[PDB]
Design a protein around this ligand. Structure first.
Ligand SMILES: C[C@@H]1C=C[C@@H]2CCCC[C@H]2[C@@H]1C(=O)c1c(O)c(-c2ccc(O)cc2)c[nH]c1=O
Ligand SMILES: C[S@@+](CC[C@H](N)C(=O)[O-])C[C@H]1O[C@@H](n2cnc3c(N)ncnc32)[C@H](O)[C@@H]1O
Length: 396
């Protein structure tokens, strides 16, 4: 591990004077530098500093959450400085408490202190001065996921030390005090909490376009060779933005020949929020745990659905699609494919999904589930720079 410190020290020299020059540097040279600093921190640190760093992260997020809630970030102008006293008068809060929590963010570099008594925003804190997907993600992480993680030791004593699956008795619902409610029922308990999750999830809206990654002209051929045939069925496709993004790309394949499927309540909202003559696919309310209604489509897409469920439930879902598929049909599973071992962010998400009854999977775990549903994996397209993939499956 001698040369690891040198690859990073040579990467911190490249980034060093690109700052002094002001010239931007490649998008994925920032991500390798980000990864190196983490790993080096891992090497140099010992368990004592690990615990201190972890505890500092919890205090930092607590200060972030409170100063957001108290509108303190709003009260700090985006440029220039303001005194702690003036901030405290603006938000009507004890200047001593404002100062102590601000000092946490000064010490970690989220805020900057000027002199003995003035505070100012940095690039790292400006997103928290308004409502947007980043500040929503901050709030959701703290209000939703942190209590569930904290409750896990007691959860696994209570329910047994096994992977948690199932709609009721989630770690989340247990941590909320009502293990009989589903996560949907709980986030619906207050339309403000529902609104934050919706805004927060907008950050992953654009995600990884199926349009650029997958060719689809073979579907157009089928669309031309059979102009009577269901083309693309988006199983659990929510708003159908994936489907629309595809069909402008594919000349002989039009949005009107595709089918957006989701729960009836979701489909009804699609209807009520669409402009009168907008071009639209067919809309079908349905339950993908039951028989697939559209038979013989060219492509079935199931994107970011299977990770919410156990292997057994995924086999049920996929078996319904396999039964509806024809011999030339393709099923595309859009999911993270964990490496063994997984990356830091995907392992993080794997445990967050456990709090709601889901999991991320390796390609071996997908293969087991796909085969049990009477399918086989023909290929995988993996996004550049990450692990989110489209797994191309066909009838076995
Ligand atoms: C937006 C959310 C709010 C704050 C969290 C803080 C940062 C880590 C996770 C964030 C959360 C989040 O991103 C979530 C996901 O990405 C997914 C997700 C999981 C697998 C996928 O193939 C695609 C998306 C599921 N459920 C989430 O909640
Ligand atoms: C994580 S969202 C994925 C949305 C879309 N596929 C995308 O990539 O953004 C999961 C979707 O599955 C839908 N869903 C959950 N259970 C379902 C079911 N039993 N039948 C049909 N759709 C379901 C939800 O309404 C939601 O729109």
């Amino acid at each position: 591990v001698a040369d690891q410190l040198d690859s990073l020290a040579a990467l911190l020299t490249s980034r060093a004077q690109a700052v002094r020059n002001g010239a931007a540097v490649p998008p994925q040279q920032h991500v390798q530098l980000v990864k190196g600093l983490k790993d080096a921190a891992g090497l140099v640190n010992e368990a004592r500093e690990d615990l201190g760093d972890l505890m500092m992260s919890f205090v930092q997020v607590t200060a972030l959450r409170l100063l957001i809630k108290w509108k303190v970030f709003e009260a700090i102008p985006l440029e220039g400085t303001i005194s702690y006293a003036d901030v405290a008068a603006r938000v009507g809060i004890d200047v001593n408490l404002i100062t102590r929590l601000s000092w946490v963010l000064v010490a970690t570099g989220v805020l900057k202190q000027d002199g003995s008594d003035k505070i100012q925003h940095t690039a790292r804190s400006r997103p928290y001065a308004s409502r947007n997907p980043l500040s929503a993600m901050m709030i959701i992480g703290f209000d939703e996921y942190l209590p569930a993680l904290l409750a896990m030791p007691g959860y696994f004593d209570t329910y047994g030390k096994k992977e948690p699956f199932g709609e009721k008795h989630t770690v989340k619902a247990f941590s909320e005090g009502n293990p009989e409610l589903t996560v949907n029922q709980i986030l619906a308990s207050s339309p403000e909490r529902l609104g934050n999750m919706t805004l927060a999830m907008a950050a992953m809206e654009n995600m990884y376009p199926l349009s650029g990654v997958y060719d689809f002209s073979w579907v157009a051929a089928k669309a031309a060779s059979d102009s009577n045939r269901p083309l693309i069925v988006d199983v659990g496709g929510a708003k159908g933005h994936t489907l629309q993004a595809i069909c402008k790309d594919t000349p002989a394949l039009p949005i009107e020949r595709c089918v957006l499927e989701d729960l009836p309540r979701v489909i009804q909202v699609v209807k009520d929020t669409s402009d009168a003559g907008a071009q639209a696919p067919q809309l079908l309310g349905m339950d993908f745990n039951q028989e697939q209604p559209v038979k013989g489509a060219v492509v079935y897409l199931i994107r970011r659905c299977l990770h919410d469920y156990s292997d057994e439930q995924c086999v049920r879902i996929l078996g319904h699609l396999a039964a509806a598929m024809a011999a030339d049909s393709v099923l595309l599973i859009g999911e993270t494919v964990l490496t063994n071992p997984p990356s830091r962010p995907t392992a993080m998400m794997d445990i967050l999904l456990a709090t709601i009854g889901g999991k991320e999977r390796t390609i071996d775990a997908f293969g087991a589930v796909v085969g049990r549903a009477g399918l086989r994996i023909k290929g995988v397209c993996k996004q550049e720079g990450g692990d989110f993939s489209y797994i191309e499956c066909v009838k076995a």
